[PDB]
Amino acid sequence: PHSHPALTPEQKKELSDIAHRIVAPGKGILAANESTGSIAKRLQSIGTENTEENRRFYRQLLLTADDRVNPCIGGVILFHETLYQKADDGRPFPQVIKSKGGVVGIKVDKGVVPLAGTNGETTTQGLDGLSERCAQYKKDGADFAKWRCVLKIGEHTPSALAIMENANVLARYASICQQNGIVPIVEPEILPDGDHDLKRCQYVTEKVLAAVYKALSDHHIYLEGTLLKPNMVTPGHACTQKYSHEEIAMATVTALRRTVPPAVTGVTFLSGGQSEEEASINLNAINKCPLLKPWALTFSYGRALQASALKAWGGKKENLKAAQEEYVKRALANSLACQGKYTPSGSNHAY
Amino acid sequence: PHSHPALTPEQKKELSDIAHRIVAPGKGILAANESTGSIAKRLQSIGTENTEENRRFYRQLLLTADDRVNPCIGGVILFHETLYQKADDGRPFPQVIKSKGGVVGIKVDKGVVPLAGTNGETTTQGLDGLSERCAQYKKDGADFAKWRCVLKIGEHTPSALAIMENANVLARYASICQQNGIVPIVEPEILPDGDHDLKRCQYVTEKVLAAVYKALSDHHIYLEGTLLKPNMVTPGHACTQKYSHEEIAMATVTALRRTVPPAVTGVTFLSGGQSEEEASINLNAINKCPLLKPWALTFSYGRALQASALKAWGGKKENLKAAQEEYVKRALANSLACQGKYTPSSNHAY
Amino acid sequence: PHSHPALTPEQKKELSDIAHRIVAPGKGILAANESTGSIAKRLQSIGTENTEENRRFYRQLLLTADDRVNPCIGGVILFHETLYQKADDGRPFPQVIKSKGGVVGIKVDKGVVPLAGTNGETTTQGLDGLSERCAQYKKDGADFAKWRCVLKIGEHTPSALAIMENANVLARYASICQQNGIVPIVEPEILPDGDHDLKRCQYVTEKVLAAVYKALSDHHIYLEGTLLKPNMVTPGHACTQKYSHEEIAMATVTALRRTVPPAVTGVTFLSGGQSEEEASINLNAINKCPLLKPWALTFSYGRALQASALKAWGGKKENLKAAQEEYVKRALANSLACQGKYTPSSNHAY
Amino acid sequence: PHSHPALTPEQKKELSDIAHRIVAPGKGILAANESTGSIAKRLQSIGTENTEENRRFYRQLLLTADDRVNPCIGGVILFHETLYQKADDGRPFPQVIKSKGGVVGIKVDKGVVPLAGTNGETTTQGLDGLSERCAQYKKDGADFAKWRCVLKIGEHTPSALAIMENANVLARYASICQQNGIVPIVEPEILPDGDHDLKRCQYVTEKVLAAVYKALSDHHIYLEGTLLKPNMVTPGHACTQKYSHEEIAMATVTALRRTVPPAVTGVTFLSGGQSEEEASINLNAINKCPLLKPWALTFSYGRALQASALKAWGGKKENLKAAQEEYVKRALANSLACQGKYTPSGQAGAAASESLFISN
């Protein structure tokens, strides 16, 4: 019942200011933190060798897009490797990102691990030496981080243990980050896999987020200095019943309104497999939803921002312009979407 | 991880509509649910015998004030006895309240009890047969209820047990209420007793509300069909350090923003021993706080709406008009306060 | 992190002494606490009008059984009504029970209530005014009490809410009891209904008991002054796989060993629908189980001690001695069973 | 509410068999898993240079004591470095340990880290890549592991958060260990630091253990395949009120009886700064405590088994036999203590009476 301030007023101000700049009106996040193993399949989808130079060239392609993306990109999440690479002109990538008005982010978790005694459920590791890593990343230009936990809707999942454990590890990660001037993006992703319907996803999301915020509270997390990266509430991939973007928006916004304290600076949705256009339309519908929303509702897209660019590039240098144009187009669409101003041209009691 | 809908879309609508009517813009709650015991000292101070007729008369005095209070009062909380009494014109009090555009509320808890193994901490009882009681109160005109839990800031309080237990019982009470079409006002009051400062009260308030909402989630409570009746965040009653109404407002709004989901329809502050003017001024500063507030921030005052009316009445029938006049003045003042339109005459530090 | 003794050394000794007397070697509990409604079916099966007189006579029949039951019965659980009734010779039933060497117990819960948002799950009510009731019961002869929570094994049950809520209410009941010199029998019954197998029951029993004891710890419960009344670990009633009594014993003892602290004075198993002979044979196997058991493993049988007696009686006073003989036989059988001396004539797999 | 067996019957048998061998009647654990930074002051006190060779030598001194310790030592906890060192004869230490009938253990936690927002409280790290580390350690001779969590008694500690977080990480560590055939020793140490009395320590120990076992249940831990390494229940090191060995034993056994499920195979007490003689005497009293104890109550001493040895060695190779003799003496005494058959005479020596307490 006694307070022992985890953060000073100055530390809180820095964390809060960073969080707000990332999700400022019209801005979202480019999630380009795919690891070597993760970026492997993506590079082969266009028949390109998975070398460090090709990964540098590709990341450079996205980060050096023209000034049209500047007002669209509030932040860029990078993988460790990319944080220390440089553009052709010799500029460190984080410098490139900042010069264009973006805040630099760094993925810091070390992947999921199986939870014994569960039906294929996992938790996420990466807390060991995390404080030292955050201190170093901060010094090297990063101001926010990302940690991904994965939950799955199934027969007996997410289980009580999976929910409690993932919620608890996120809080620890958030706690260590804030001690080092790093704004933590809390990502409790509920996979869309399965034949469950919209209300099932909404129910689970509601229970997951309630657990997440109780954990953050127990660990004394400064919410104004954090961001939330949740899945949108949608039916399962194999769901037979069809839903409109308006229903997906209502279910998503309702789930958030029932669990996310208004103190949380912003919600940056993951695209989780949605097509580029689908992810944009949904985000737009979410922002159009006729319910009060006390936090910024924007994007933190990986696939939803890179699909076309990757394809347009094909691993050929001559395609650089064509590839960047594709990325710029998605950046613009989503910039409008997080403001509910997107257009193809450019009963809540039932929830 | 499986849903078994506690409420149908129809029941949700009913609860949500009720909650919104109670806290509609510029409206607040008159808490006149004092038991014979708590009202005892009130009437005693004014040398008035605590009879059933005197209590009926006094309640009548408040409930029948002129229409000027209509836009100020969204709801009135009554004690069992009063829910079944009638005004001089034969009109039962619930009807009197409704005809004035107010929703009828009923106190349902059965008081605090001691938690063994704690330093004077308590939990609250009253769950036994609560479902049948709610169904009957609903039939008799009540659309919302009140249940009060009490927590205290001390050397070792509130303890983990007290927070968890009080949070859990509030959830049980809320669950049973919603099953009977009654909007539950969740009241986790943290007493102002003690010499702790503003930051301490904010800390404890944040921890208690986080516990309350996690409990309500575990029990499948429909937040849109509930109201929150918390203490404002203020320094202890005996704190040597002094603060401004703006600091109290900032502390209060910050604590709420960090713990109360936007889905909660409204927050109805208890006065907790504050003077009538102080309660209105703080409520005003709260609504003027330069932070986003996704819920109505109004009042559910007992003492802060009756202090002057009770003294003006003095137990004399010929002082009826004068007594009501004082109540109206406080109703008007607070109606303006919950909108930030009342005039008596660096948030990172929180 | 700071202690505020819920009990004094004297209060502890009293509770521990009572708890130990009830489960002394060779002794068990006769659960005769059926309410008018729960005993209705039983009386109907024998075409006997459910009147206070017939109930009084039936209870008298059991309580006045000959001295052979004395070393078999350490305690007797009564329903409120019976605690205040007298034998034909005028002796109050509590006095009759005590004159035969038994401790008097009383049921104090007020039945189960539905938990909104769950698949037919429940919690139990009865805390309101419990302290006052316990003090009164203590004064009137009772030294221990019983409170029944009910959980069910199903596709989604018991849920996290049900397990948590039932464990918490059991802890509240336990605390209140100990504050009044009453030994609480904690009964978290997991129904045998369903087609689940033995390992499913064991898993669920382990999870429920782990929850029960964490709750008792959180509420500062003096374990040495309590008793546990759990279900034995068995397959569901509709399960098609067959098991031996040795397997039921191994699963039951393994589950208890993994969750019940050694400090718990005793485990008094409910018969939960098992026949008289089955309940005795299982209790026997449980006591002969190779594993080390730090607590007494006896009975707290209702149906398993009355089946044959109720039938031999048929509501006919002429069958008094025939009926009592049946009860006496089961009392003797179970006394031997709780010692592993009854005869009707790879633990890593758990 | 549905089961998904974390372990097969075979895995359970292997884990249970290991746990029982470590705490078999009369047997205890030698805790020699001090890190270079930890064993630094130890070697410093005896003017011994903290080199890898000196550490290797000192560990060999303990591990190669004569056969009299065989019946006394059920297990030996080692530090990563030592697990891969060899004795003068070329034999890997794990083999030396096994040849003497002991089980090899390995310390796997990566130390304590501060819990933000608390009054100097910590949690412990070391879960990253623990699964792979355990599989490797297993292949290299280790059959059990140790992970240390540290809690402190104070005005506001241990806090609800510290208790919950530490109990949770211990459970994660135990879950990963059991998945790799490694028996985890759960160590939730409540420091003796402070002026609190006996009942205060008992109260805190009871709350901490209840939290630890609830977490272990939540994480589906096989208790029979685990060991508990707790602090004995004693007054604070600065407490004015004095207590007898019988009272300490009573408080300790009572705390354990109210929280530790009978399924737990054994409790291996940490000496926590107690002198060698004090640790042995208390363990003896604990085993003679009248109350029923469904689990083996033995030792897992670090300081309490090495105090006299270190002093007798002094870094001098010529004092090998002298040093080992002191170790053997403490091992024999504790072997009897964990059987409630220890009765000091007066020859222990001033080194076995010195307070091995170290503030934090």
Tell me if residue C53 falls in helix, strand or coil: helix
- Chain A residue whose CA is closest to B205: A1
CB–CB contact C257 D257 (8 Å): no
Question: What does the alpha-carbon distance between residue D244 and residue D289 come to, in Å, rounded to a whole number?
Answer: 13
Chain A partners (3+ C-beta pairs within 8 A): B, D
Active-site pick, A14, A34, A165, A187:
A187
Q: Any bridge partners for residue D266, and if so which?
A: D227, D296
CB proximity D254 to A under 8 Å: no
Q: Any bridge partners for residue C266, and if so which?
A: C227, C296
Question: Domain range spanning residue B18?
Answer: 1-350
Specify the DSSP class assigned to residue A225: G
Question: What does the alpha-carbon distance between residue C146 and residue B280 come to, in Å, rounded to a whole number?
Answer: 50
Question: What does the alpha-carbon distance between residue C161 and residue C119 come to, in Å, rounded to a whole number?
Answer: 11
CB proximity C290 to D under 8 Å: no
- The angle at the Cα of C196, spanning C192 to C202, to the nearest 5 degrees, equals 75
Q: Which residues contact D219 (CB under 8 A, 6 or more apart)?
A: A116, A117, A161, A165, D171, D172, D174, D175
- Tell me: is residue B21 an annotated ligand-binding position: no
- Give me the residue label for tokens 């397959």: C235
Residue A317 designated active-site? no
A128 vs D7, D118, D128: nearest CB? D128
Residue C77: its H or E element: strand C73-78
- Tell me: is residue D45 an annotated ligand-binding position: no
CB–CB contact A293 B262 (8 Å): yes
Residue among A147, A59, A137 at smallest CA distance from A96: A59
Tell me if residue D227 falls in helix, strand or coil: strand
Residue numbers in C near D263 (CB within 8 A): 254, 257-258
Q: Which residues contact A136 (CB under 8 A, 6 or more apart)?
A: none
DSSP secondary structure letters along B221-288? --GGG-EE-PPP----TT-SS---HHHHHHHHHHHHHTTS-TT--EEEE--TT--HHHHHHHHHHHHH
Residue among A78, A76, A77, A85 at smallest CA distance from A51: A85
- Chain B residue whose CA is closest to C219: B161
Question: Identity (one letter) of the amino acid at C290?
Answer: P
* Residue A71 CA: distances (Å) to CA of A104, A294, A306, A332, D305: 15, 22, 18, 9, 67
Question: What does the alpha-carbon distance between residue A251 and residue A258 come to, in Å, rounded to a whole number?
Answer: 11
Q: What six digits make up the tokens of A102?
A: 């973006």
Question: What does the alpha-carbon distance between residue C218 and residue D159 come to, in Å, rounded to a whole number?
Answer: 14
Q: How was this structure determined?
A: X-ray
- Tell me: is residue B131 an annotated ligand-binding position: no
Residue among D266, D310, D288 at smallest CA distance from D74: D266
- Residues of B numbered 155-174 whose beta carbons fall under 8 angstroms of chain C's beta carbons: which are they? 156, 160-161, 164-165, 168, 172
Question: Identity (one letter) of the amino acid at D301?
Answer: Y
Cβ neighbour number for residue D91 with a 10 Å cutoff: 16
CB proximity C8 to B under 8 Å: no
> Nearest-CA distance from C190 to chain B in Å?
20
Q: Any bridge partners for residue A139, and if so which?
A: none
Q: Per residue in B227-250, is it b (16+ CB within 10 Å) or e — as a string?
A: bbbbbbbbbbeebeeeeebebbbb
CB proximity D117 to C under 8 Å: no
> Nearest-CA distance from B78 to chain C in Å?
21
Residue numbers in A near D172 (CB within 8 A): 123, 165
* Residue A94 CA: distances (Å) to CA of A19, A84, A271: 17, 8, 24
Q: Which residues contact A128 (CB under 8 A, 6 or more apart)?
A: D110, D125, D126, D127, D128
Q: What six digits make up the tokens of B171?
A: 């959830």
Question: What does the alpha-carbon distance between residue D298 and residue D301 come to, in Å, rounded to a whole number?
Answer: 10
Q: Return the residue in A20, A202, A204, A217 with the most chain B beta carbons within 10 A, the one to mutate for interface testing.
A: A217
**Dihedral pair phi/psi, residue B233, rounded to 5°:** -90, 110
Tell me if residue B189 falls in helix, strand or coil: strand
Residue A149: its H or E element: strand A144-151
In chain A, the number of structural domains is 1
Q: Which residues contact C51 (CB under 8 A, 6 or more apart)?
A: none
Cβ neighbour number for residue A189 with a 10 Å cutoff: 17
Mode of pairing for the β-strands spanning B183-190 and A73-78: unpaired
> Nearest-CA distance from C133 to chain B in Å?
14
The CATH number that applies at residue A94 is 3.20.20.70
Residue numbers in A near D119 (CB within 8 A): 2, 4
Q: Return the residue in B8, B12, B109, B115 with the most chain C beta carbons within 10 A, the one to mutate for interface testing.
A: B115
Torsion, CA A65, CA A67, CA A73, CA A74, rounded to 10: 130
CB–CB contact C260 D259 (8 Å): no
Q: What six digits make up the tokens of A349?
A: 């009691």
Q: What six digits make up the tokens of C210?
A: 């782990």
Question: What does the alpha-carbon distance between residue C164 and residue B214 come to, in Å, rounded to a whole number?
Answer: 13
D125 vs A127, A155, A219: nearest CB? A127
> Nearest-CA distance from B84 to chain C in Å?
23
Cβ neighbour number for residue D135 with a 10 Å cutoff: 15
Residue among A313, A348, A299 at smallest CA distance from A69: A299
Question: What does the alpha-carbon distance between residue B281 and residue B245 come to, in Å, rounded to a whole number?
Answer: 7
- Give me the residue label for tokens 């948590």: C164
Q: What six digits make up the tokens of C280?
A: 């005795």
The reply to whether omega before B230 is within 30° of 0 (cis) is: no
* Residue B176 CA: distances (Å) to CA of B135, B144, B183, B226, C162: 10, 12, 10, 12, 15
Tell me if residue A301 falls in helix, strand or coil: strand
Cβ neighbour number for residue C14 with a 10 Å cutoff: 18
Size of interface A-D (CB pairs under 8 A): 82
CB–CB contact B4 C118 (8 Å): yes
CB–CB contact A350 B258 (8 Å): no
Residue numbers in C near B218 (CB within 8 A): 160-161, 164
Question: What does the alpha-carbon distance between residue B28 and residue B283 come to, in Å, rounded to a whole number?
Answer: 11
Question: What does the alpha-carbon distance between residue D46 and residue D34 come to, in Å, rounded to a whole number?
Answer: 16
Q: What six digits make up the tokens of A25?
A: 């009106």
Largest CA distance in chain D: 63
What is the number of alpha carbons within 13 Å of residue D152 lying toward its C-beta? 17
Residue C327 in contact with residue C309, Cβ under 8 Å? yes
> Nearest-CA distance from A282 to chain B in Å?
21
Residue A18 in contact with residue A103, Cβ under 8 Å? yes
Q: D79-82: list long-range contacts, CB under 8 Å, 24+ apart.
A: D79/D32, D79/D33, D79/D34, D79/D35, D79/D107, D80/D106, D80/D107, D81/D36, D81/D52, D81/D55, D82/D32, D82/D33, D82/D55, D82/D56
Q: Per residue in D315-352, is it b (16+ CB within 10 Å) or e — as a string?
A: eeeebbeebbbbbbbbbbbbbbbbbeebeeeeebbebb
Q: Any bridge partners for residue C78, and if so which?
A: C32, C106
CB–CB contact A261 B257 (8 Å): yes
Question: What does the alpha-carbon distance between residue A214 and residue A168 come to, in Å, rounded to a whole number?
Answer: 9
Q: What six digits make up the tokens of B42?
A: 């009130």
Cβ neighbour number for residue B90 with a 10 Å cutoff: 7
Residue among B32, B55, B57 at smallest CA distance from B320: B57
Residue B282 in contact with residue B310, Cβ under 8 Å? no
Q: What six digits make up the tokens of C299?
A: 């009975």
DSSP secondary structure letters along D251-303? HHHHHHHTTS-TTS-EEEE--TT--HHHHHHHHHHHHH-SS---SEEEEEESH
Q: What six digits make up the tokens of C73?
A: 């019965």
Specify the DSSP class assigned to residue D102: P
Residue numbers in B near C116 (CB within 8 A): 6-7, 175-176, 178-179, 219-220
Q: What six digits make up the tokens of A39?
A: 């970026």
- Give me the residue label for tokens 């002129």: B66
CB–CB contact A261 B258 (8 Å): yes
Breaks (C-N over 2.5 A) in chain A follow: 346
Helices B52-63 and B303-313: angle between axes, nearest 10 degrees: 110
> Nearest-CA distance from B156 to chain C in Å?
7
